[PDB]
């Protein structure tokens, strides 16, 4: 690849659209070139939650699927930094939704969205409905967190989207089992029906 630019990456993160545009108009920077930590302009724009910049960079046909050294794409940055407007735009542009977000548990993009933003969780499932049942590194899906700590309405949401109650985590437990362990009688009753 060609030259990367610290000034561009910083302007993208900080949200300075005029500066991004002035730097890109020179056609001297390879917009897909990765810096020393694997970061691109798009990852910086997404991490900083800068929709206008992200839209501009998408108009230049940047690669959506480059990963930084932590293994995250621009979409994972958007979701983990609560930039759900950016996440939506990236999903629309065809960004891969079947990815893992950074952290010890290896949660799926879907699991992180399901905890934080229902609309993005639905956008993800519209792309690949089987992600509802894709487990993290402990063998748990989104249903397990709700079984422990959530409410019967949350159980209903995930079951309506196809959550499979029979799935077992790496300890051999179902969502019903973890509800019972957590003394969550309401979710246990909802899972039992």
Numbering used by the authors: 26 to 218
Task: Show the paper's wording.
Here we show that Bdellovibrio bacteriovorus utilizes a small ankyrin repeat protein, Bd3460, to protect itself from endopeptidase activities during entry of prey. We demonstrate that endopeptidase complexation by Bd3460 prevents cell wall decrosslinking, and that both the Bd0816 and Bd3459 targets bind this self-protection protein via a common epitope. Previously, we assigned prey cell rounding to the action of two secreted Bdellovibrio peptidoglycan DD-endopeptidases, Bd0816 and Bd3459, that act to modify the invaded cell wall via hydrolysis of the structural 3-4 peptide crosslinks. In summary, we conclude that we have identified and characterized the first ever self-protection protein encoded by predatory bacteria—ankyrin repeat protein Bd3460 from Bdellovibrio inhibits the prey wall decrosslinking enzymes Bd3459/Bd0816 and in doing so protects the predator from the shape transition that this catalyses in prey.
